[PDB]
Amino acid sequence: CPSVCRCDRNFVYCNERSLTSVPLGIPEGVTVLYLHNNQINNAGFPAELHNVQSVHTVYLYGNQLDEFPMNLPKNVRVLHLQENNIQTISRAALAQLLKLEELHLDDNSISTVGVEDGAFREAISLKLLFLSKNHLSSVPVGLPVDLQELRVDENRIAVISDMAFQNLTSLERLIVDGNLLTNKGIAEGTFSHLTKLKEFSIVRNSLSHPPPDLPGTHLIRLYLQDNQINHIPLTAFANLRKLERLDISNNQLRMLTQGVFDHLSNLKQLTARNNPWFCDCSIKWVTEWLKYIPSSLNVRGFMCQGPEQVRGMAVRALNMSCP
Numbered sequence: 001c002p003s004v005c006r007c008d009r010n011f012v013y014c015n016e017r018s019l020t021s022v023p024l025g026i027p028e029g030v031t032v033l034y035l036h037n038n039q040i041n042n043a044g045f046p047a048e049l050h051n052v053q054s055v056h057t058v059y060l061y062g063n064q065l066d067e068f069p070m071n072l073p074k075n076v077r078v079l080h081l082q083e084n085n086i087q088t089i090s091r092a093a094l095a096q097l098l099k100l101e102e103l104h105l106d107d108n109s110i111s112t113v114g115v116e117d118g119a120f121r122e123a124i125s126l127k128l129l130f131l132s133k134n135h136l137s138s139v140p141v142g143l144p145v146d147l148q149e150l151r152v153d154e155n156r157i158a159v160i161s162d163m164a165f166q167n168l169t170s171l172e173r174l175i176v177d178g179n180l181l182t183n184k185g186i187a188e189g190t191f192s193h194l195t196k197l198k199e200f201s202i203v204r205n206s207l208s209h210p211p212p213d214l215p216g217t218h219l220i221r222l223y224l225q226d227n228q229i230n231h232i233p234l235t236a237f238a239n240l241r242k243l244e245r246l247d248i249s250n251n252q253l254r255m256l257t258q259g260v261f262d263h264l265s266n267l268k269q270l271t272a273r274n275n276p277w278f279c280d281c282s283i284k285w286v287t288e289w290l291k292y293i294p295s296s297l298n299v300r301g302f303m304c305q306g307p308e309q310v311r312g313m314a315v316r317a318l319n320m321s322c323p
Contacts, residue, residue, distance in 0.1 A: 001025055014038065015059070022049060032057040033073070036080070039064045045071045050096060060084070061104075068093040068119075075099045077125075082106035091116040094123045102128040110134035118142030131155070139164040139176070147171050153201075154178040162187035169195050177203040177223070189213045202227065209233060216240030225271075226250040231257075238263045249273040249301055255282040261289070273301035279310040281322035290316040 001007040002023035005014040007030075014023060015034040021044025022035060030052065036059045048071075055073040062083040070093050072079070079100060086108040094100070100123045110131065120129065121142035129144075131152040138159045139152060145167045157179040164187075165171075171194050181202065191197070192213045200214070201223040209231055210224050216239050229251035237243075237260055244266055253275045261267065277283065290299060302315035310318070 001027060020044060022046065024048065026052055028052060029054045031055070032059075034059050036061040036063075038062075041065065042067045042069065045069050047071050050074055056099075070096065072097055078102040080104045082108070085109055087111065087114045089115040089119045091119040091122055094119050097123060099125050101125055104130045105134065106130055106132040108134050110136055112137040112140070115140050120144060141166070143168060145170065149173040151175045157181055159185040160187060160190050162190050165190055165194060169193065172196055172218075173199045175199075175201045177201045177205065179205050181205040181207065183208050183211070186211060191215065199223075210236045212236065214240060216242055219243055221245040223247045224251070228252055230254070232260055233257070234260060237261060240264065242266055244268040247271045249275065251275055254278050255280075256286060258285045267297055269298040271300050275301065276305045277303065277315065278306045279304035279313070279315065279318065280307075281320065283315055283318075284320055284322070286315050287318045287320070 002025040004017055005012065005023050007013065007027065010029065010031050012026060012030050012033045016037045019038045019040055022040060024046055026049060031054065033055050040060070040063045042065050050071040050073060052073045053075045056075060056077040058072065058076050059080045061080050065084040065086055067088040068086060068090050074096065076097055077099060079097070079102065082104050086105060087110060089110060103126060119142060120126065120140060121144055123144055125146065126144040127146060127148045129147060129150050133154045136152065136155045136157055138157055138161065141161060141163050147168055148170055150171060153175045157176060158181055174194070174197060191211060192215060194215055195217045197215060198218050199221040200219065203223055203225040205227050207227045207229060209229055219240055219242060222243060225247050229248065230253065234257050241263060243264055245268060249271045250273065255278060286302065290302065293299065304310040304313050304315065
C-alpha cells in the first residue's frame with residue numbers, strides 16, 4: 001500500500017488526495033480501485049499497474065488526463081473516466097483492456113479526429129459505451145461487435161455513415177440525442193442491421209422526418225421528441241409491429257398521413273404535445289381513429305392550434321364542416 005494513499009478491506013482509496021500520478025504500491029489481490037477527484041496526468045501510469053489482474057472496477061473521475069490511459073489493469077470490467085479533459089483515444093490503450101465490459105467517457109473534450117480508426121473495436125468485451133457530452137462530429141466506424149448500449153448523447157454529431165453500425169447486431173439501446181443531426185446527414189439503411197435494438201432516442205436534433213428503414217424485430221421504444229419533423233412518411237412506422245412506446249412531441253407537424261399507425265398493433269403510449277396541428281378535413285381520420293382506439297393505448301397531445309374557430313379543442317372531441 002502507498003505512503004499517502006490508504007487501503008481498507010481489499011479496496012484502494014487514493015481518492016481526494018491531490019495525487020499527480022497513480023501510486024506504485026498497488027497490492028496484487030485488490031477488488032475495486034479508487035483514484036477519482038485527483039490531478040492525475042496522462043504520463044502518470046506505471047507499467048506495473050497493468051500486471052495486477054485482480055482489479056475489475058476502476059474509478060478515475062475529475063482528473064487532468066488528456067488522452068486515454070495506458071498500462072491500466074488487464075482484467076478491468078467497469079472503468080470510469082468522466083469529468084476529465086480527454087481529447088485523444090488511442091488504439092493501443094483499448095487493446096490492453098481486453099476484458100473491459102463498461103466504459104464511461106462523459107464530460108470530456110473527445111473529437112472524431114482524436115478517436116483512432118478502430119480504437120473502440122479493439123475492446124472485444126465492450127458491452128456498454130457512454131460517450132455522453134463530448135465534441136464528437138460523427139459516430140465512429142470502428143465499434144465493438146458485442147456492444148449492447150451506445151450512449152453518444154449531447155454531442156456535435158451531424159453525420160452517420162452506413163459502415164458506422166457494421167456487425168453491431170447485439171446492440172439494444174442507441175441514444176443519439178442533443179445533436180446537430182439531420183435526415184440527409186444519416187446514410188441510407190444505416191440502422192437497418194440493428195436487429196436486437198429495443199430503444200432509439202434522437203431528441204433535440206434537426207430531423208425533417210423520422211429515420212427511414214428502421215428495424216422492428218425487437219424495437220419497443222422510439223423517441224422522436226424536440227425535432228424539426230414537418231411530415232411523417234406512410235412507410236416510416238411500417239414494419240415496426242413490436243413497438244409499445246412512441247413519442248412525436250415538440251415537432252413542426254401540421255397533420256398526419258392516413259394509415260400511419262396502421263401497422264403499429266402492439267402500441268401502448270403515444271405523445272404529440274407542442275405541435276401546430278391544423279384542424280381541417282386532413283385530420284378527419286385522426287378523429288375517427290381516436291374514437292375506435294382501445295383504452296390500452298395512452299394518446300396525449302392532440303390539440304388544435306389552428307384555425308381560431310377550432311383552436312384549443314382536442315382532435316378526439318371534434319365533429320365535421322366537410323364531408
